[PDB]
Amino acid sequence: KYFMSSVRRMPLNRAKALCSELQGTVATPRNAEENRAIQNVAKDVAFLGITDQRTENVFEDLTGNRVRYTNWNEGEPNNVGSGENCVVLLTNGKWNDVPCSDSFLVVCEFS
Amino acid sequence: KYFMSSVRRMPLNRAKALCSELQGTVATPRNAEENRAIQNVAKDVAFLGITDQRTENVFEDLTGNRVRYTNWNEGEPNNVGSGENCVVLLTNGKWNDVPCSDSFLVVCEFS
Ligand SMILES: OC[C@H]1O[C@H](O)[C@@H](O)[C@@H](O)[C@@H]1O
Ligand SMILES: OC[C@H]1O[C@H](O)[C@@H](O)[C@@H](O)[C@@H]1O
Ligand SMILES: [Ca+2]
Ligand SMILES: [Ca+2]
Ligand SMILES: [Ca+2]
Ligand SMILES: [Ca+2]
C-alpha cells in the first residue's frame, strides 16, 4: 500500500476523481500504522476515503465496506451544521467529520 | 520507484500537471527493468518524461537532465512534420517521438 498527498485543496468529489485518475482511491486507514503513514504524507488536513452518506453515523469506505478501525478526535463525529458526511485526518492524526462540499487536501492510496 | 497509469488521455503539459498534483513526475525509465515496469502498467500508448524541446535530437528528462538509456522503436526518433519533441512508450515497449500537443495516457512515477 502506497500513499501520496495532493498539493492543492478540493472537495471530496474532485478528490475521488483525482485518486481514481491514477487508478487508486482516497486513503482509508485500516489501523494505527496506516493512519500514521497517511498523516506523515499529508502536510495539512486531508480527506480520507470514509463517509456516512448512505446511512448517518454508519461510516464506510468508498466501496461500501463499514470501517472497523477509527481514530476520532474527541467530540467527533458530531455531524454539525446542516450535516457532515465526509471525513478528514487532522494534522494530529485524529479524525473529524466535515461537509463533503468543503475543500481539503487529499491522500490517495495505491497498491 | 512506483509507477501508475492514468485512465484518460491528455497532452504532455496536462500529464505533467496530473503527476505533479500528487507530487510525482512523468515516468522516465533509466534502464530496461524500469521500462518493462512501465509497460506492466500502461495498457495503451503512454507519455514518458522525456523531450528534446531544448535542442532537437538531444533528449532530456523533464528536469533538463540528458538521458542515457533509450529504447527507440525502429525508425525513431524521426521528428515528423512540424515536429515531434515529446516521447511515448508504444505497446511493444519501444519508444516513439510525438507532438507534445497530442494526447496519450500518462504513466506517473513516485518514489
Ligand atoms: O469544534 C469542532 C468542530 O469544528 C468545526 O465546526 C468543524 O471542523 C466541525 O467538523 C468540528 O466538529
Ligand atoms: O510510422 C511512424 C510514424 O507514425 C506516425 O506518423 C507518428 O506516430 C510518428 O510519430 C511515427 O514516427
Ligand atoms: Ca454525517
Ligand atoms: Ca465534525
Ligand atoms: Ca524533436
Ligand atoms: Ca515519431
UniProtKB/Swiss-Prot annotation, chains A, B:
Keyword annotations of the record: Calcium, Coiled coil, Collagen, Complement activation lectin pathway, Complement pathway, Disulfide bond, Hydroxylation, Immunity, Innate immunity, Lectin, Mannose-binding, Repeat, Secreted, Signal
Location in or out of the cell: Secreted
Highest taxon of source: Eukaryota
GO biological process assignments: antiviral innate immune response; cell surface pattern recognition receptor signaling pathway; complement activation, classical pathway; complement activation, lectin pathway; defense response to Gram-positive bacterium; innate immune response; killing by host of symbiont cells; negative regulation of viral process
Primary residence: secreted
Assembly and interaction partners: Oligomeric complex of 3 or more homotrimers. Interacts with MASP1 and MASP2. Interacts with MEP1A and MEP1B and may inhibit their catalytic activity.
Domains (record comment): The coiled-coil domain mediates trimerization.
Name this polypeptide is given: Mannose-binding protein C
The species this protein was found in: Rattus norvegicus
Gene that encodes it: Mbl2
